[PDB]
Amino acid sequence: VDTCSLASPASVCRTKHLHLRCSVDFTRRTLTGTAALTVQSQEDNLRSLVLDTKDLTIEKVVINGQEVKYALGERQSYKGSPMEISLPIALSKNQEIVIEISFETSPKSSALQWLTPEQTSGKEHPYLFSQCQAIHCRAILPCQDTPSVKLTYTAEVSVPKELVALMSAIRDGETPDPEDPSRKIYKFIQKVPIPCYLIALVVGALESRQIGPRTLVWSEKEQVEKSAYEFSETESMLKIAEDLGGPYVWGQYDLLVLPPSFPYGGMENPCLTFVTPTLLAGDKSLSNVIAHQISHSWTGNLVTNKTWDHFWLNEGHTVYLERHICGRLFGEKFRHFNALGGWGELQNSVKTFGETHPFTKLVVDLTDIDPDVAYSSVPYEKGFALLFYLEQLLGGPEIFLGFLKAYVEKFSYKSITTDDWKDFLYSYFKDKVDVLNQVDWNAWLYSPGLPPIKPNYDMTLTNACIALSQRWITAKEDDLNSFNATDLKDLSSHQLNEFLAQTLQRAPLPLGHIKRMQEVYNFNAINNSEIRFRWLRLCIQSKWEDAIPLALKMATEQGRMKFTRPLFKDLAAFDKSHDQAVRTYQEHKASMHPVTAMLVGKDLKVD
Ligand SMILES: [Yb+3]
Ligand SMILES: [Yb+3]
Ligand SMILES: [Zn+2]
């Protein structure tokens, strides 16, 4: 039972295939067309079924060439409205039928962002992009919006001829629209069964550049060159991921660099990973985000969480694989450095929510909780920490990677729970059950706060970061003159970011210290989004008024939630910038991503 879905569960019926025929109307801000669902009954004498929908307009439902009765239930907040369809003929178990639903989306669809030409790099054409994870596919089309159901799909998308449509599928040709010569139809095929949160669409003035044997990078023309360089390690990361997880089954691995309002660092849409342009640091330093999306091709897209309560299965294993990819490219001391950094991010999340907060539990009960509200670093970092702890307990990385590959093989094309994962772990490690029985399972999986055990981390690369952060924290006014640009000479960008994260954990620092840090290190000149984000938070929390315009600009010129949300929160918490923070949000709200707008609104207590 998926408590986030209002549709018939997988035990009643299952969608096997979706054939989508739609048209993108930029003037009306709507997607209109037909969703033809091939549904298999799992029960005898099946006479009706229920689908998830959210702000959809339904024109008609057609089965066997005739219109059928349907009814929309009362809206259940963020879950949308259930749509019950009356079947014309009762179905036997395993019988399949095709249900063709004619629909139209709302311009306020929570799955979509519509951009005017002014909001794009090129300034001549509009742009549209989707983001279905977790439960926004129901705001695009009627479906069993649950990851417990996997389906293949085909799609034909009509767009204005000057634009390009792309999807989470293999490109299957393009033709002029026969019904309209000012339009083009783009075709797509997804032959591997996927959960519907993996359905994705982009429409815009897109250009491509090849960067590997199975990879194109896509973006507006202005970002193509920078993107091709930034993500050049993609093929090398795919090869390592295949060695760790087994064959890459998806055919293509393309990357799409979205406009700055994209709310995540990356989204693992199959065949077409979506990424934020905030990765464009100019030195490939933020490539771990690509390693993470690549890893989801196994942990998440092949082996999927049965419900959102088990989201840590997708995230924890992906972060574990991501850190191994970067470890293979840059060494074991670097994997430990990132693992230790992740523990710090977990300390921060637990401090923010509070140690008894239910959102700090690894497995969360999402009945009546919007998954967008519950989203945090917890499933990523507490999930990673559990696997890293198990790796150490069980004999090391080579042994634990053997389990990860067997786990992917066992559960490929399926949707599983925490209990399915735990049972297989016990089965694989049957000769080490005495070791497994020492794990405090109740605490790790179901208790709030920090986990009961902290793993062992090599500190080689972290030492210089801690040492410099401690010099600044313990410094008095008479020590400020001892700091100089030479303090940073032997630090990588990763180490500079970690020095800032360590210092930010002890913020505020005195205003004189922050001013000195700018005087000697010129952090205001750094373009790297992660470093700039932590530096600005440190400035604002330390009450530097000069940083207010810089923090407001970063919070609005991009929309990656990881940055926008804490920047707005820090600005609202500083008396000097409070009013500016609220006004800026109110002015930008109408042109923000709908999910980001809702979350920033809640964080600021502005309705
Ligand atoms: Yb074809
Ligand atoms: Yb002193
Ligand atoms: Zn992820």
Author numbering: 4 to 610
Could you give the paper's own sentences about this structure?
Overlaying the structure of LTA4H bound JNJ-26993135 (compound 11) to that of PGP bound in the active site showed that simultaneous binding of the two ligands would not be possible due to steric effects. However, we hypothesized that by removing the part of the compound which interacts with the Zn2+, we would be able to have simultaneous binding of the PGP and the truncated compound to LTA4H. On the other hand, in the exudate of the LTA4H KO mice, over 80% of the PGP was still present even after 24 h, suggesting that LTA4H is the dominant enzyme for degradation of PGP in vivo. In both exudates, Ac-PGP remained as stable over 24 h at 37 °C as in PBS. This indicated that, as already observed by others, LTA4H cannot degrade the acetylated version of PGP. Although LTA4H is the dominant enzyme that can degrade PGP in vivo, the physiological relevance of this activity seems highly questionable.
